[PDB]
Amino acid sequence: ITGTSTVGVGRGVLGDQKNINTTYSTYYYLQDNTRGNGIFTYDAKYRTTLPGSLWADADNQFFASYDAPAVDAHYYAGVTYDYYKNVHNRLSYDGNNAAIRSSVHYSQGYNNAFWNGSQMVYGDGDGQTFIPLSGGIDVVAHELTHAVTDYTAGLIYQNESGAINEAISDIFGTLVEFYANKNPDWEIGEDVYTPGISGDSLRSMSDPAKYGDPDHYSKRYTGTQDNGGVHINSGIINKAAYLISQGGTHYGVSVVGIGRDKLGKIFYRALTQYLTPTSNFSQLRAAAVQSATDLYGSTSQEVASVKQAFDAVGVK
Numbered sequence: 001i002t003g004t005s006t007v008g009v010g011r012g013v014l015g016d017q018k019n020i021n022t023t024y025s026t027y028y029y030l031q032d033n034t035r036g037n038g039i040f041t042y043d044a045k046y047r048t049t050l051p052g053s054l055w056a057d058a059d060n061q062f063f064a065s066y067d068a069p070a071v072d073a074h075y076y077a078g079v080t081y082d083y084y085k086n087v088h089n090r091l092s093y094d095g096n097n098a099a100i101r102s103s104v105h106y107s108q109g110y111n112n113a114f115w116n117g118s119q120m121v122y123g124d125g126d127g128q129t130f131i132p133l134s135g136g137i138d139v140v141a142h143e144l145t146h147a148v149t150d151y152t153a154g155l156i157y158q159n160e161s162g163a164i165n166e167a168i169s170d171i172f173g174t175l176v177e178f179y180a181n182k183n184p185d186w187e188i189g190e191d192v193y194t195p196g197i198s199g200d201s202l203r204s205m206s207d208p209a210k211y212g213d214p215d216h217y218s219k220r221y222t223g224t225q226d227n228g229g230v231h232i233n234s235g236i237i238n239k240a241a242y243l244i245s246q247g248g249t250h251y252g253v254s255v256v257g258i259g260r261d262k263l264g265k266i267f268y269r270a271l272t273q274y275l276t277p278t279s280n281f282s283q284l285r286a287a288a289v290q291s292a293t294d295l296y297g298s299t300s301q302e303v304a305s306v307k308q309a310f311d312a313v314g315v316k
């Protein structure tokens with residue numbers, strides 16, 4: 001909408017106060033004009049028709065319980081935009097400052113979040129498996145990264161390419177969480193998963209097997225559920241990425257860590273210059289090796305560590 005840029009204040013899902021960029025024209029809208037061609041957050045009003053209505057508020061204060069998922073979807077989309085722009089010189093998900101749209105309060109009791117081809121969508125959870133999913137910065141960044149993938153490599157959402165697609169979203173979700181630097185970890189979704197259970201998470205990148213996901217290619221899922229295991233087999237790639245960054249010895253194979261920033265550079269280059277819609281795990285290894293070679297040189301520690309990490313997870 002046309003209006004003047006304003007700064008509201010509110011509380012997110014976890015109870016934390018934050019400032020949010022809004023737009024004033026009669027109402028204060030969740031429309032952040034400070035980033036690209038805008039970040040826009042919508043109310044789906046417990047229904048499934050999208051996007052719903054652009055979030056309108058009378059007083060620019062967002063402290064109601066109903067407001068909290070909107071505050072966080074809006075704010076964490078901004079953090080994710082900043083990560084891609086400042087770290088990778090990428091302007092929004094399409095590279096040309098496309099408007100970023102999110103809807104919250106999608107459906108009833110909805111234990112998921114997704115990119116629908118055009119926008120991000122967040123359930124409120126049922127209060128048992130999830131609380132409102134936009135409360136997780138890694139979750140928000142995971143969703144926006146699906147849009148990045150779709151505009152770049154275009155990894156088909158099934159089987160190995162789909163597990164790579166998933167892992168890319170978990171990797172960059174985690175790197176955005178570290179960028180913001182509030183309680184960062186290598187776990188996925190811990191801030192919004194299972195409010196009655198402390199210390200767990202939806203997935204672990206450091207130890208995928210803690211939640212039953214494979215940490216070696218020989219343990220990959222080969223059935224048809226979950227689009228051929230896209231949220232399961234992602235563990236193999238998540239573990240490789242974790243090892244590249246942090247190092248470790250896994251199934252007897254030692255990996256020298258090179259840190260998160262270099263992990264992000266390698267995987268961003270692989271995603272945007274080498275992967276294709278049909279890339280499989282072996283082709284991801286080759287893309288990561290080539291990316292590290294481009295950035296650091298063929299004789300570099302970074303190339304050697306990429307090879308060690310894929311060896312450790314059984315991907316040749």
Ligand SMILES: CC(C)C[C@H](NP(=O)(O)CNC(=O)OCc1ccccc1)C(=O)NC[C@@H](C)C(C)(C)C
Pocket residue numbers: 111112113114115116117133138139142143146157188189202231
């Ligand atoms: C980061 C996480 C909190 C949320 C993330 N959402 P996502 O990976 O983004 C789900 N996405 C999804 O299933 O997309 C299918 C689709 C939708 C629309 C158009 C085309 C395809 C995700 O991992 N969901 C699976 C969990 C909830 C399980 C338990 C596997 C059902």
Ligand SMILES: [Ca+2]
Pocket residue numbers: 057058059060061062063
């Ligand atoms: Ca208000």
Ligand SMILES: [Ca+2]
Pocket residue numbers: 177182183184185190191
């Ligand atoms: Ca965390």
Ligand SMILES: [Ca+2]
Pocket residue numbers: 138174177184185186187188189190
């Ligand atoms: Ca996390």
Ligand SMILES: [Ca+2]
Pocket residue numbers: 190193194195196197198199200201
């Ligand atoms: Ca929990």
Ligand SMILES: [Zn+2]
Pocket residue numbers: 142146166169
């Ligand atoms: Zn996903």
